[PDB]
Amino acid sequence: CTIPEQQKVILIDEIGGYDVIKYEDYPVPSISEEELLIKNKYTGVNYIESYFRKGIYPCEKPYVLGREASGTVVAKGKGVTNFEVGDQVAYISNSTFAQYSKISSQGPVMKLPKGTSDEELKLYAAGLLQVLTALSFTNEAYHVKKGDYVLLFAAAGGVGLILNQLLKMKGAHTIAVASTDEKLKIAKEYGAEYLINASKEDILRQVLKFTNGKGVDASFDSVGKDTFEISLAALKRKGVFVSFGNASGLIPPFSITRLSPKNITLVRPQLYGYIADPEEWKYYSDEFFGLVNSKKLNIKIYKTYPLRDYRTAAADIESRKTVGKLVLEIPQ
Amino acid sequence: TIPEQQKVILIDEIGGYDVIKYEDYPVPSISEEELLIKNKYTGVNYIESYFRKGIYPCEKPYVLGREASGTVVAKGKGVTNFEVGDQVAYISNSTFAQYSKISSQGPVMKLPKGTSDEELKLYAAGLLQVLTALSFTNEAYHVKKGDYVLLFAAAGGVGLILNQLLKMKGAHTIAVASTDEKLKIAKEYGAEYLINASKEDILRQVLKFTNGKGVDASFDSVGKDTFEISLAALKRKGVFVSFGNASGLIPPFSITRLSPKNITLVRPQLYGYIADPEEWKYYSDEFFGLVNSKKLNIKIYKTYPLRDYRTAAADIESRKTVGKLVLEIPQ
């Protein structure tokens, strides 16, 4: 493959509104002996980019957006032996809102079979973050068992949609909580056994009703501050509280002795801490491949936008009324 | 026959060792599912100091004691799992007494009729500490073979059992204590690595022993002053087990601090692990097997007559004391 020196990327030079988002000429990164150069086809949109653009989170400018992507290896370093030029890949790296990105061949990159379709590649880019999070959280944060009653908040959200399917597959009884009946409809479609409307119903009361007053074996809570007391009270004796996501960062300081009456285990995990080791990446990405390739797991996509039209995607996600993953497509 | 009055240790008010009273008190009556137990020995726990100082509230007069061994002298008409004359080890109320009671369905276990008086002392001395250490290393954090485990208060009651269990399980204990004498006893009880907290940088030594990787788990009962050390000493995905009274004095915790290393936090207490009859049976049987066989040794400090708990209270509140304090009940 002929590697160009200049490419097109989505980047921000300054903090501000949607007008600061630039589709601009940028260098193609050079790769080391151990690295892959990847020509991108699809890349997932995360809400965190809005925080960088608005200046809520700091970042060095110019900042090229994007972390999760799928595409084709167009070049590799001299020391790369686990990948070939032409291989289709899904990966987590830097600056993926781009025609070309780079990653270590030893890093979080997974090989995909020859002849993987563009639609399948879209699914991998859309599902990378959410599925690996859902797998690791249900394997290590709390190991979900058959027969478990599991409380699930934000059931129609990105991770929530995967959790609905995974908990069903593990033979667990999912109690899904969502803000609207419309979101609960989707939760049920994705495998939820019980449904609670957060706006209309007493959550704790319904959880106890479904669990016969015993409570849940675990709570996967990404709502945070508003549901912290509910999750804690809803848990069975010796139950496990899995708090996660941006909203869980809003939970006020907590006296740890409150975990004592019911011997509650508390975890606030993040994805990267479960895929830090090459052995850990291999394990979870192999499981992720198994679920998507076999078509046992559905990856819901809200809409696909051209890379240069990220401004529209940014406006869409910030409305907070989207259901399903927002994906960017890079024309080849 | 059973007498109407008995000798007990009680507190009428909050204060120093002067509020501890050796007084005449009614022998309790028992209902249809209860056992009346004539105590032979009872273990001294630091919790009685917390009631006396006013740290924990209690209705006064308050008869002290929760951990005892003795013989069933009476039972309710519905009791079928115990007989009059059975030797027992149990957890209940008001055990600093000649006579105490418990539900036959509560935390009480039958002992063999061949049980000696020396064994009765051992069971009363070890009951709470062993059950705590067993359940904490089984459910709070399930210790695996090859684990590196940080242990604070290593020469304390629970600490000395933890040293033994961690060694038994093939784990590698890093023991922390205030003096060299305390670390010495910890080592003899199963500790592998020793850190003097008065003399050494704890975190620096832990990272040295684990080759910079940290510990798989921390069992920390020191609380506020070691919370930062425990969190930093833990490996990625490690488990923080905070326990005991010192956990209450830890400032309110921002849970986002668990995220950089995906740390699991548990603040367990014994009774949440023995709430079910099946759970009590599991751990109490484990306790008996280990202590009766001498696979777990119960380090004793001294034995006192019930009337002399005043001295025992001063001894346990003194730091230089290592080992369980036991009270001998007048027969």
Swiss-Prot record, chain A:
Record field: catalytic activity: 2 a quinone + NADPH + H(+) = 2 a 1,4-benzosemiquinone + NADP(+)
EC number(s) recorded for this UniProt protein: 1.6.5.5
GO molecular function, one term: NADPH binding
Range of residues in the leader sequence: none
Family listed: Belongs to the zinc-containing alcohol dehydrogenase family. Quinone oxidoreductase subfamily.
Name the record gives this protein: Probable quinone oxidoreductase
Pfam families for the chain: ADH_N, ADH_zinc_N
GO BP term, example: cellular response to oxidative stress
Gene name of this polypeptide: ZTA1
GO annotations of cellular component type: cytoplasm; cytosol; nucleus
NADP in keyword set: yes
Alphabetized InterPro entries for the sequence: ADH-like_C (IPR013149), ADH-like_N (IPR013154), GroES-like_sf (IPR011032), NAD(P)-bd_dom_sf (IPR036291), PKS_ER (IPR020843), QOR-like (IPR047618), Quin_OxRdtase/zeta-crystal_CS (IPR002364)
Keywords on record: NADP, Oxidoreductase
UniProt cross-references to PROSITE patterns, sorted A to Z: QOR_ZETA_CRYSTAL
Domain of life: Eukaryota
Swiss-Prot record, chain B:
UniProt cross-references to PROSITE patterns, sorted A to Z: QOR_ZETA_CRYSTAL (PS01162)
Enzymatic reactions: 2 a quinone + NADPH + H(+) = 2 a 1,4-benzosemiquinone + NADP(+)
Broad enzyme group: oxidoreductase
Any GO BP annotation: cellular response to oxidative stress
Keywords for this protein: NADP, Oxidoreductase
GO cellular component labels: cytoplasm; cytosol; nucleus
InterPro entries: ADH-like_C (IPR013149), ADH-like_N (IPR013154), GroES-like_sf (IPR011032), NAD(P)-bd_dom_sf (IPR036291), PKS_ER (IPR020843), QOR-like (IPR047618), Quin_OxRdtase/zeta-crystal_CS (IPR002364)
E.C. number(s) listed in UniProt: 1.6.5.5
A single GO molecular function term of this UniProt record: NADPH binding
Cysteine pairings via disulfide bonds: none
Top-level lineage group: Eukaryota
Entry's family note: Belongs to the zinc-containing alcohol dehydrogenase family. Quinone oxidoreductase subfamily.
Protein name: Probable quinone oxidoreductase
The species this protein was found in: Saccharomyces cerevisiae (strain ATCC 204508 / S288c)
